Amino acid sequence: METVQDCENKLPPSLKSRLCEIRRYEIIEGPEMDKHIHCVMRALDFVYEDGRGDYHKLYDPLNIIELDKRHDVNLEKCIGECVQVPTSERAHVFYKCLLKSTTGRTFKKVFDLMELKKAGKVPQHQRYTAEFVQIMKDYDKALNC
Ligand SMILES: NCCc1c[nH]cn1
Numbered sequence: 001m002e003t004v005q006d007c008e009n010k011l012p013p014s015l016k017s018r019l020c021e022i023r024r025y026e027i028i029e030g031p032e033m034d035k036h037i038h039c040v041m042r043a044l045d046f047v048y049e050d051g052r053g054d055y056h057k058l059y060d061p062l063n064i065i066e067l068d069k070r071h072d073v074n075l076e077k078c079i080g081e082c083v084q085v086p087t088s089e090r091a092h093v094f095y096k097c098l099l100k101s102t103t104g105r106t107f108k109k110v111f112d113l114m115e116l117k118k119a120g121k122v123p124q125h126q127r128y129t130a131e132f133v134q135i136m137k138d139y140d141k142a143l144n145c
Helices: 004-009 018-025 032-042 059-065 070-083 085-101 104-118 129-140
Strands: none
Touching: 004 032, 004 104, 032 085, 059 104, 070 085, 085 104, 104 129
């Protein structure tokens, strides 16, 4: 599997210099970002190959971090939205939609946890704890972020 790190390494110079924005989930539009977000959402296994959000990769993890009937509603909304867009762009629309919804703040936790869990920096059962926040801070620091 290509990793999030591999995606970042292949960013065009124009986007590498905005890596810290990207890793803070700031939205940046345009076709190279459409490509990057597809890459990372694939790497963390959140979307299908055409870029469609996978309800089942997120419903449980979202609810375990923070139980909320809105996660269901938001997933359906954002999947509905991404399916209406060209595939070149379907991962990024899903991601943007999720971040703009009330589920956004919990999605960022699930994403951060999955990234570090795959990188072997934390155990598979790692929760979003104070220690985890510090672990991610140190992780980003080594990336110049
Ligand atoms: N841990 C956040 C990495 C990221 C967020 N958005 C894109 N890449």
